Amino acid sequence: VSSVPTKLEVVAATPTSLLISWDARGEYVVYYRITYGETGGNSPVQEFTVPGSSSTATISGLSPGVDYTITVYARSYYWGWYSPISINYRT
Amino acid sequence: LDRFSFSVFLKEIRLLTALALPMLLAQVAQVGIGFVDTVMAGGAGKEDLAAVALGSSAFATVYITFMGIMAALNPMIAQLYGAGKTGEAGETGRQGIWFGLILGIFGMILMWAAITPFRNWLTLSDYVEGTMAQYMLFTSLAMPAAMVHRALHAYASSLNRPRLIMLVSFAAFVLNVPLNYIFVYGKFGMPALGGAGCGVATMAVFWFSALALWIYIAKEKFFRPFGLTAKFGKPDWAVFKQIWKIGAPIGLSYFLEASAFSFIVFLIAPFGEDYVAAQQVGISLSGILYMIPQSVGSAGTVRIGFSLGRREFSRARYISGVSLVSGWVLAVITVLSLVLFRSPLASMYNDDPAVLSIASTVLLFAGLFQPADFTQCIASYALRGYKVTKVPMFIHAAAFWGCGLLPGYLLAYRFDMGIYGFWTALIASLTIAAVALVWCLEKYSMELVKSHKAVSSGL
Ligand SMILES: COc1ccc(CCN(C)CCC[C@@](C#N)(c2ccc(OC)c(OC)c2)C(C)C)cc1OC
């Protein structure tokens, strides 16, 4: 029983692509995943995935400036998942 | 057309206790370079052709310009003090200190060289035992500029936090210049009289403040990577090329007062040159308590661009008001104790050259420009202070000079007692920043809407 990664920060973009620099204060026995959907659930989900203190990274921004809703995932000792936090602010 | 400047006062919530007051101690030390200049000014009076300052003057010219360029790292290293690699700020610190040479060299070289033509076409002068003997103490008076940059690069690595040393090695500075300036202007056993051994003498003590830098890696954790600080990768080395678009336009914007040069002194002499020329106890004592003021934005500047790196978005651009106006406090309180008083001819032991028979048609911009700009550039010193912002500050001043065209011959083109007459659209050039500038600052203050792309996370 806990909380998320924690912080909420895309800063912006290289229009097409985007920054995603979030709270990841150190790592854990860790791993991350980020969702890669917009906000319809139509154009499917995608999975970036990373490790260290590394919620503080960035995407492969694929289309124009439509609403994109993007989650990041905790993981630790028990190979299971702290809690995700998520956000949608898209271009 | 009513308010293209949106949220007025709301650079505010309850910030009362923003203790940006090591910032004072950027200008508690920075009074130091004040409180030398005039020892050299009021020491080389024991020579009366010590108008030395004629050099020590148009020296500051290429110092203070290039110093702009260098005052440029005041963001650089705060912006990355919201980081951890004080050595990847360091690799920059080093990289600038390297720059700190480089320019200082190439600058002091312009001096080093060009100088001579202190005589050209509509041009020349000739008290030779005067500063001709000292145009050869322009040089000595010049030959630090290599080492001064490197030792102003100093305070650009005070940025960080600990501003304590700067205070020390400037209170341990006029420790020296008395001492050394006597010995080297006169009292030998053995270096007798390079009489204007102020310029010889001052220049000495740059090198001393310079390795009053060095001597303060000592304190805490390193900022030392000056192993052959290098430059190259593509066309030319960034973290150097980087330092360009910040540096440049603050010097070329310090070319503001570097033409509040051709003005502040040019119609000090029509057929009436009396206390018109004496607007120097005017605009020298203008400059004196202008630093302790304005110099705090050139100190606010940290508190922001750093508090940007530490990702505290506008939890700091909305201190770039609570500073703005915490000095705006003093903006008035000492324009009050400005126009108020006149006793510039302090009768204790004596003065420097400012003397008794003059009117005080000078307290009349102890108002004009004095509170209405106290602030108006410490805008940028937080625009840059925070941000890229001097690319259009360079151009902030595309008007603050080039709108003084007739606000130059507007003292001499008058209807009343127009002594502050061309202090027209140059104290109104000077208040087209309470718009132009801070108006920009609550607009780009509000890219911390654009960049704070997620107001509040989980808990
Ligand atoms: C960057 O220019 C300067 C600005 C302020 C000062 C401080 C002035 N000091 C109180 C010294 C006395 C002022 C004085 C000198 N020297 C002076 C003031 C202003 C001058 O024009 C900028 C000046 O000509 C160089 C000399 C007197 C003799 C006319 C010196 C400066 O250079 C000498």
Residue numbers in the entry:
A (entry chain B): 1 to 91
B (entry chain A): 5 to 463
Copy text verbatim from the article accompanying this structure deposition.
Integral membrane proteins belonging to the multidrug and toxic compound extrusion (MATE) family contribute to multidrug resistance by using either the Na+ or H+ electrochemical gradient to extrude drugs across cell membranes. MATE proteins identified thus far can be separated into the NorM, DinF and eukaryotic subfamilies based on amino-acid sequence similarity. Those crystal structures revealed a similar protein fold comprising 12 membrane-spanning segments (TM1-TM12), they nevertheless suggested different arrangement of cation- and substrate-binding sites between the NorM and DinF proteins, hinting at substantial mechanistic diversity among the MATE transporters.
Hypothesizing that NorM-NG would interact with verapamil differently from DinF-BH, we determined the structure of verapamil-bound NorM-NG to 3.0 Å resolution by combining molecular replacement and MIRAS phasing. Notably, the verapamil-binding site overlaps substantially with the multidrug-binding site in NorM-NG7, with verapamil and drugs including R6G following similar trajectories within the central cavity and projecting themselves towards both the N and C domains. Furthermore, the bound verapamil in NorM-NG adopts a folded conformation, with both aromatic rings stacked on top of each other. This double-layered conformation bore little resemblance to that seen in verapamil-bound DinF-BH, which does not involve π-stacking between the two aromatic rings. The most notable differences between the R6G- and verapamil-bound NorM-NG structures reside in two extracellular loops termed L3–4 and L9–10, which cap the multidrug-binding cavity in the transporter. In verapamil-bound NorM-NG, both L3–4 and L9–10 moved away from the multidrug-binding cavity. Overall, a small number of amino-acid side chains make direct contacts with the bound verapamil in NorM-NG. Among them, S61 (TM2), Q284 (TM8) interact with verapamil through H-bonding interactions, while A57 (TM2), F265, V269 (TM7) and P357 (L9–10) bind the ligand via van der Waals interactions. In addition, the carboxylate groups of D41 (TM1) and D356 (L9–10) are ∼6 and 3.5 Å away from N8 in verapamil, respectively.
